Amino acid sequence: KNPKSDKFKVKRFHHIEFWCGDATNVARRFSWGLGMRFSAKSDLSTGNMVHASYLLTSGDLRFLFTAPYSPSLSAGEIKPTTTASIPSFDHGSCRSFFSSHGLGVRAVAIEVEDAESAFSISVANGAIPSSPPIVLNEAVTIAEVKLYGDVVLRYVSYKAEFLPGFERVEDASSFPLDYGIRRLDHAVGNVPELGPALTYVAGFTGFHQFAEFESGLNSAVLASNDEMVLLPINEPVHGTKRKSQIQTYLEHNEGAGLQHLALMSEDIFRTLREMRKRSSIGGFDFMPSPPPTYYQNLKKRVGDVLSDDQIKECEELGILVDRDDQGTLLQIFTKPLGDRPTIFIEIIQRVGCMYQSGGCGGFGKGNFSELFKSIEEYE
Amino acid sequence: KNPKSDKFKVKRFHHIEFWCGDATNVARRFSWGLGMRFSAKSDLSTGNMVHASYLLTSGDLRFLFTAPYSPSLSAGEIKPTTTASIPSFDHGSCRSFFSSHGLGVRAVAIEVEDAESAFSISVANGAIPSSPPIVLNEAVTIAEVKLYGDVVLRYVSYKAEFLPGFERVEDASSFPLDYGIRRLDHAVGNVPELGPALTYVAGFTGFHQFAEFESGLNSAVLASNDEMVLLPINEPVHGTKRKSQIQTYLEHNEGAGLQHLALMSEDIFRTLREMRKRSSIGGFDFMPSPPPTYYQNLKKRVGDVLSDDQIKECEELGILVDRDDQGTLLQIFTKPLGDRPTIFIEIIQRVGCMYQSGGCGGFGKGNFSELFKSIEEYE
Ligand SMILES: CCN(CC)C(=O)N(C)c1ccc(C(=O)Nc2nnnn2C)c(C(F)(F)F)n1
Ligand SMILES: CCN(CC)C(=O)N(C)c1ccc(C(=O)Nc2nnnn2C)c(C(F)(F)F)n1
Ligand SMILES: [Co+2]
Ligand SMILES: [Co+2]
């Protein structure tokens, strides 16, 4: 049941902003590991004496990597006279964020019809303001409200090139990498208690609950009107045998924050082939493959959507497949993106629901015991 | 004139330690950009609840990348009960270092006959203690004294595998990259005033001055007895036409620190070919090539050591060559390794002085006007 209760008009994920200590090194690692291209920059070469920001993009996906310079470079400026292209940026907030959380996402940014109305309506419905609406170059307005822990939801709208103040990087410094990933599918937070986290976020957005046809966690998914913007949220279930990786997240992250970004690819087999080739030469590593008892048991679960030639292809790459009432889902997980066992990336491709409807296949909830039973069948 | 006045027995560069905010992402970028292999680790998988440290090595060169975890993971430990494998590590120092300087070198580590005597003799001759000698697993002793700004000189000695507490990483996670770089040649600091910086460092080491057969800077080089350990130091010359890149360093770095690491390669042409191939896919970029007026004018300067077939090879890669009284030197510079225009890397190969004697060829001092005259000859 989709009541379409969005309190304002939201279009689609716009970008994800990472707060790091060195933007260049993280951005270069991500660029090579994920086959994202170097798109735009704001830094000292563009007159930005405040922060260094680098945008990677592939398909519609935009990853923004930001880090602070020395405050001494901008000591004489004031907020109206600033050179920062992200007006919400602040040195102490950024330093306090990275020192507290390690590498992680600061903002999940959705495009809206009008950011200032989206900001006004939001706080009027309970959102905690983070940065009030600011109009950039009479062309883009930007506003931020708190989402959970230290991550904010960032509203973006254009009257009418990424953002004012950003230059387009040299064509020779830009190399057209592409491993098939195309857009952000969903972004998932971990919180100490989901109920208040849901009430608050559903409270100011009007997002509705998505259908979700020892766990380790309890989860629930928030969705815009066309179910394109999807914001799941997990919580721990204290008392299981094996300590919950959600609670593990909370202790190493110092509280709530973004757990994983799920990136959809137009060809998951080719994406995984190219990311796997780079695992040990600077890219990303993946979580251990499941035992073949799993892939042996899958013909009896998805043999209608997939030829056993390509289910074999799934066992090579360690891909995971599940199915909901309407579609089936292929998914695999990277190991944590940095030092701490916190934020990781999911690669997904969804088939069905045709002009594809959001959420087609669910989020792999059935895999918890599809893997557990599989582990048991081996031993 | 080499008086051999070293106040204690120093063998050779041991390692370089980088303090970052995320050790993994910097280490992966460096590994791919420089063709260094993943060698050893100390982190949560090795029981280290304090810091994450990753060693890359190629030839005799060892790059150590360290970042702090949340202090909450180790809140109950005390210095005798610590799990840190680098006993000198401290959370506040590390966080204050990276927030102040950006990515940069914290320690230049030289191997000695006996670290505690080297530490004792050093401070007795003026060194400012940083971390007193500590014996690791009755097998390695470690001590640190201040060198300039916030970088320390780290003494290492073995009675008799990198350091106690470090495990050797899995062979499948280790990929045998190698672009020909083999050992560290010299490491160069920038300071506000060189005289006091030299007096102090020459004061506690006994290192002697190396021969150095609008500048932009004034420099001087410190050398151990066999002139293997080389510690140059630059200072600005205020008042030139173009602002001194040394002073530029000091303002963006927030004071003194390490300016460049010079890595020697067994085949600079192949090193540069392989690093250049990766410039735009995650590696390192190089400073703009010189105009061919330079390479046209070089036959009349080094045509005896190099065939014009390989001087052509030098013009492709933008390599730079100079010569001293005994040897000739090939060198090229990377752009800064991170966000700030601070620390960069030099690649070098030295021919001559044969069983090769340190410093063979100098440090490219003649290139300042070999490039200036060349720039003028074009225009
Ligand atoms: C190998 C270990 N491993 C992942 C670490 C698993 O075993 N399993 C069973 C899964 C399966 C799906 C998802 C997921 O993606 N859920 C989701 N995505 N959006 N909303 N939700 C709720 C997650 C995750 F990522 F949340 F933890 N774990
Ligand atoms: C392209 C711009 N550019 C480098 C940025 C230059 O134009 N020139 C002329 C040089 C030449 C050599 C060295 C060097 O390596 N000197 C050294 N090494 N050890 N001791 N010393 C004193 C340096 C450096 F790296 F110090 F700045 N600059
Ligand atoms: Co997911
Ligand atoms: Co040099």
Looking up residue A362, the CATH number of its domain turns out to be 3.10.180.10
Q: Is A364 in the pocket of ligand 1 (CB under 6 A)?
A: yes
| Most ligand 2 atoms within 8 A of CB, residue of B346, B369, B376 to mutate | B346
Nearest CA to ligand 2 atom 12: B364
Tell whether B311 and B196 lie within a shared domain: yes
Whether B154 and B143 have beta carbons less than 8 Å apart is answered as: yes
**SS3 at position B74:** helix
Q: Are B230 and B222 in contact (CB under 8 A)?
A: yes
Q: Is A87 in the pocket of ligand 1 (CB under 6 A)?
A: no
Q: How far is the CA of B367 from the centre of ligand 2 (A)?
A: 8
- Strands (DSSP E) found in chain B: 10-19, 37-42, 51-58, 61-68, 104-112, 129-136, 140-148, 151-158, 167-168, 181-190, 208-209, 217-223, 230-236, 257-265, 320-323, 327-333, 344-352
A163 and A187 together in one domain: no
- Token pair of A360, please? 């087609």
Q: Scanning the structure block, which residue is given the tokens 């140059």?
A: B232
Domain-embedded: residue B60: yes
CB contact under 8 Å between A251 and B72, yes or no, is yes
Chain B residues with CB inside 8 Å of A283's CB? 28
Tell me, yes or no, whether B120 and B188 share the same domain: no
Size of interface A-B (CB pairs under 8 A): 127
Regarding whether B119 and B100 lie in a shared domain, the answer is yes
Annotated binding-site residues of A for Fe cation read: 186, 260, 346
Q: Are strands A327-333 and B129-136 parallel, antiparallel or unpaired?
A: unpaired
Burial of B298 (0-12, 13-18, 19+ CB in 10 A): buried
d(CA B14, CA B63): 9
* Contact indicator for A162, A205 with CB cutoff of 8 Å: no
A289 touches chain B (CB under 8 A): no
- Structural domain ending residue among the three candidates B173, B190, B212: B173
Q: How far is A120 from chain B (nearest CA, A)?
A: 35
Q: Quick check: is A189 in a domain?
A: yes
Residue A342 lies in a domain: yes
Answer whether residue B297 is part of any domain: yes
DSSP code of B163? S
Domain shared by A208 and A143, yes or no:
no
- Residue with the smallest CA separation from ligand 2 atom 5 is B333
Residues of chain B with C-beta less than 8 angstroms from the C-beta of A177? 281
Residues A353 and A262 occupy one common structural domain: yes
The beta-carbon neighbor of A338 closest among B24, B32, B337 is B24
| Residue ranges of B 225-284 with Cβ closer than 8 A to chain A | 251-252, 254, 280-283
Residues B143 and B63 in one domain: yes
Q: Hey, is the C-beta of B358 within 8 angstroms of any chain A C-beta?
A: no
Kindly state whether residues B226 and B141 are assigned to the same domain.
no
Last residue of a domain, one of B139, B173, B207: B173
Q: What token pair was written down for B306?
A: 């190099």
Specify the experimental method.
X-ray
Which resolution in angstroms does this entry have? 2.0
In a domain, A375, yes or no: yes
Task: Provide, as residue numbers in chain B, all residues whose Cβ is less than 8 Å from the Cβ of A102.
Answer: 21-22, 69-70
* Structural domain ending residue among the three candidates A140, A173, A206: A173
Residue of A nearest to B282 (CA): A28
- B233 and B109 part of one domain: no
Between B26, B44, B282, which is nearest A32 by CB?
Answer: B282
Structural domain includes residue B107: yes
Whether residue A3 lies inside any domain: the answer is no
10 Å CB burial of residue A60 (0-12, 13-18, 19+) is: middle
DSSP B234-300: EEE-TT-SSPPHHHHHHHHHTS-EEEEEEEEES-HHHHHHHHHHTTTTTS--BPPPPPHHHHHTTHH
- HEC string of chain A equals CCCCCCCCCEEEEEEEEEECCCHHHHHHHHHHHHCCEEEEEECHHHCCCCEEEEEEEECCEEEEEEEECCHHHHCCCCHHHCCCCCCCCCHHHHHHHHHHHCCEEEEEEEEECCHHHHHHHHHHCCCCEEEEEEEECCCEEEEEEEEECCEEEEEEEECCCCCCCCEECCCCCCCCCCCCEEEEEEEEEECCCHHHHHHHHHHHHCCEECCCCCCCEEEEEEECCCCCCEEEEEEECCCCCCCCHHHHHHHHHCCCEEEEEEEEECCHHHHHHHHHHCCCCCCCCECCCCCHHHHHCCHHHHCCCCCHHHHHHHHHHCCEEEECCCEEEEEEEECCCCCCCCCEEEEEEEEECCCCCCCCCCCCCCHHHHHHHHHHHHC
| Chain A: residue whose CA lies nearest to B285 | A173
Q: Which residues on B lie below 8 Å from A337 (Cβ)?
A: 24-25
Q: Which of A184, A207, A261, A346 to mutate to test the pocket of ligand 1 (most atoms within 8 A of CB)?
A: A346
Round to whole Å and give the CA distance between A319 and A302. 13
Phi/psi for B194 (5° steps) reads -75, -40
Q: Are residues A145 and A293 in the same domain?
A: no
Let me know whether B162 and B195 are in one domain.
no
Using CB atoms, pick whichever of A44, A103, A281 lies closest to residue B22.
Answer: A103
* Gap from B79 CA to chain A (nearest CA, Å): 21
Task: Identify whether B259 is part of a domain.
Answer: yes
Do A108 and A18 meet the contact criterion of CB atoms below 8 Å apart? no
Q: Which domain holds residue A29?
A: 10-173
Residue B182 is which amino acid? Answer: R
Whether residue B156 sits in one domain with residue B282? no
Nearest CA residue ID for atom 22, ligand 2 = B219
Contact A69 B339 (CB under 8 A): yes
Residue among B26, B38, B281 minimizing CB distance to A25: B26
Structurally, chain B folds into a number of domains equal to: 2
Dihedral sign of CA atoms A69, A71, A77, A79 in order: positive
Q: Do A22 and B26 touch (CB under 8 A)?
A: yes
